[PDB]
Ligand binder design. Sequence first.
Ligand SMILES: O=C(NC1CCCC1)c1cn(-c2cccc(O)c2)cn1
Length: 140
Amino acid sequence: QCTVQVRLELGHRAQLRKKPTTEGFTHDWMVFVRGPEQCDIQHFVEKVVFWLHDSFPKPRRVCKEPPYKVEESGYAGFIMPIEVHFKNKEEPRKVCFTYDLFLNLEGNPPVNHLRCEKLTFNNPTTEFRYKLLRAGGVMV
Ligand SMILES: O=C(NC1CCCC1)c1cn(-c2cccc(O)c2)cn1
């Protein structure tokens, strides 16, 4: 008879290189999933899958432990599905976000963006509830 809320932060950075790569990639970028200060999402997160554009090599990028991030070089923004899988035996087993990985046009400052996500678990099992609480989760 309980609800537990946990917080995730998804974000990215992007900057124009001083000089493009030999391939002609103009930008360095980094996407991540993290917890707020002090929290450890690794208690309830099995893994984070970042689905890169098909143009990237091995575009299914998996992080089973922190940091949950991908560092890349490229020349264009794209919509990146990001799946956060839970150490959970029942539904929901994962959440999927549609992440807008946008780059800065020439002249514009570097990108430093954050998206705060609140997950509400209705009546988690006892076992999963231990994992959510150990991560810094809160009973509503
Ligand atoms: O920016 C790239 N591709 C855009 C086209 C439409 C949105 C995404 C990109 C980067 N790469 C690459 C290749 C080789 C090593 C590497 O690190 C990156 C391939 N493609």
